[PDB]
Amino acid sequence: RGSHMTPKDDEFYQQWQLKYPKLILREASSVSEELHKEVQEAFLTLHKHGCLFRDLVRIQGKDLLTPVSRILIGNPGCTYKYLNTRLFTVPWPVKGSNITEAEIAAACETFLKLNDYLQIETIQALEELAAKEKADEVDIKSRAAYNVTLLNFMDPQKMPYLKEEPYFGMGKMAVSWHHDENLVDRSAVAVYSYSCELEGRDPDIWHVGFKISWDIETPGLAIPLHQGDCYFMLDDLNATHQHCVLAGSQPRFSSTHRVAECSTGTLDYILQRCQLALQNVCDDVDNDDVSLKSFEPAVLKQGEEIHNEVEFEWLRQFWFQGNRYRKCTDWWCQPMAQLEALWKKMEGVTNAVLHEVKREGLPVEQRNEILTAILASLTARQNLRREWHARCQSRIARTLPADQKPECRPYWEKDDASMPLPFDLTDIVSELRGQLLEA
Ligand SMILES: O=C(O)c1cc(O)c2c(c1)C(=O)c1cccc(O)c1C2=O
Numbered sequence: 001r002g003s004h005m006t007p008k009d010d011e012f013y014q015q016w017q018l019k020y021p022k023l024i025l026r027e028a029s030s031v032s033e034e035l036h037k038e039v040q041e042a043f044l045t046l047h048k049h050g051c052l053f054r055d056l057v058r059i060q061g062k063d064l065l066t067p068v069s070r071i072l073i074g075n076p077g078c079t080y081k082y083l084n085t086r087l088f089t090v091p092w093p094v095k096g097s098n099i100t101e102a103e104i105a106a107a108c109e110t111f112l113k114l115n116d117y118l119q120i121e122t123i124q125a126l127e128e129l130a131a132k133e134k135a136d137e138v139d140i141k142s143r144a145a146y147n148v149t150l151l152n153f154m155d156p157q158k159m160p161y162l163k164e165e166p167y168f169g170m171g172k173m174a175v176s177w178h179h180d181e182n183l184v185d186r187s188a189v190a191v192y193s194y195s196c197e198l199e200g201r202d203p204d205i206w207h208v209g210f211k212i213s214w215d216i217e218t219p220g221l222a223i224p225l226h227q228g229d230c231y232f233m234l235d236d237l238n239a240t241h242q243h244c245v246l247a248g249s250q251p252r253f254s255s256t257h258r259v260a261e262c263s264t265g266t267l268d269y270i271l272q273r274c275q276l277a278l279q280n281v282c283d284d285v286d287n288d289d290v291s292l293k294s295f296e297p298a299v300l301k302q303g304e305e306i307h308n309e310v311e312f313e314w315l316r317q318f319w320f321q322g323n324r325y326r327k328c329t330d331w332w333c334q335p336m337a338q339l340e341a342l343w344k345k346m347e348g349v350t351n352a353v354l355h356e357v358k359r360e361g362l363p364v365e366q367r368n369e370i371l372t373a374i375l376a377s378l379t380a381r382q383n384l385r386r387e388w389h390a391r392c393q394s395r396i397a398r399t400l401p402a403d404q405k406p407e408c409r410p411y412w413e414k415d416d417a418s419m420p421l422p423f424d425l426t427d428i429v430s431e432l433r434g435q436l437l438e439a
Pocket residue numbers: 059082083175176177178179180181182
């Protein structure tokens with residue numbers, strides 16, 4: 001049978017040193033009384049204000065409510081995507097920013113303070129890690145450049161429905177074995193754990209488990225976590241090892257600081273993209289007579305791709321969460337209004353393209369060129385629309401509370417003459433395909 005080790009086992013420390021060395025551990029004691037207080041009160045403050053939410057996530061094609069409740073805090077405009085769900089930051093106050101409710105704002109400041117301290121620690125541990133290998137500095141600093149933390153809460157008494165750990169008999173899992181997605185390559189992750197107050201790991205206490213990827217022969221590690229212990233995954237650990245969370249019996253919070261790989265995941269980035277798409281529009285005035293500067297296939301393809309990007313990675317992702325951030329802050333209210341306007345204009349662009357493709361004096365070579373440059377984009381738009389609407393109407397989603405109910409948005413009826421094109425592109429895509437096979 002597969003087995004596991006905790007500090008009670010003779011072989012624990014040396015197995016740690018041999019098969020999990022890039023896993024570091026700083027016990028509550030390395031951290032000041034002061035910061036412990038501030039940070040814990042900050043957790044309880046967010047919890048009281050109802051700021052943590054279960055994500056209606058996706059996994060092997062199945063909609064599933066995560067047993068754990070979460071919240072994302074970080075640099076303004078930043079996102080972190082896991083399990084097909086883009087979490088938007090509730091902003092903490094980096095330099096250059098000034099706003100979002102009192103006690104909540106103060107909690108954000110506090111997790112920024114925590115972010116700072118843990119960063120300093122991570123850099124020190126990676127320095128040590130290298131000098132241990134000795135027998136760039138900018139790489140280290142960018143691998144500890146935490147731009148977000150993902151907070152988690154679970155109260156096992158309230159959230160009993162928990163799976164047994166299958167390979168090492170670690171007992172009950174809060175979070176099953178996984179790799180953390182969407183992180184900068186080789187970037188560290190720093191977790192502050194806070195648990196509110198014989199053969200194997202003690203079930204009453206929280207543990208983080210690690211195993212080697214592909215491997216259930218090498219026994220796994222189960223590391224006990226009390227109030228205020230911190231652990232760190234350094235470097236390639238998150239890629240070479242898997243981790244899970246073993247549930248104790250008391251509620252527990254954690255702050256999991258990460259370098260989210262946000263090259264296509266920031267308000268700034270998606271605004272530059274929308275703008276790039278709108279470069280193809282005549283923009284003297286904002287009205288519905290949409291007229292484009294060019295129908296070169298490359299420019300049109302690009303436009304429709306950006307159209308999809310803002311619709312499905314930004315708008316539908318944001319509204320699937322049914323405006324639950326509105327509880328914590330309004331930071332994204334204006335930006336999302338603006339992205340919605342940019343997208344509406346793009347529905348305008350697509351319409352103008354469909355107008356061209358139907359234009360009498362257009363040589364069929366060129367028409368077919370247009371079709372072949374946009375067809376993929378439009379069928380992807382259709383398939384992703386079926387997906388999001390269904391995901392918004394699924395039995396599970398309809399049972400969430402009213403301030404969390406998924407919201408299929410934007411959405412308009414075929415009768416709605418405010419919008420230039422139907423929500424259901426099925427017929428249109430059929431038509432374009434048919435044209436493309438005309439002898
Ligand atoms: O399959 C599961 O039960 C499961 C549970 C989780 O909590 C996570 C995952 C899977 C991920 O895949 C993942 C990826 C990137 C960052 C993350 O934080 C997670 C998770 O947290």
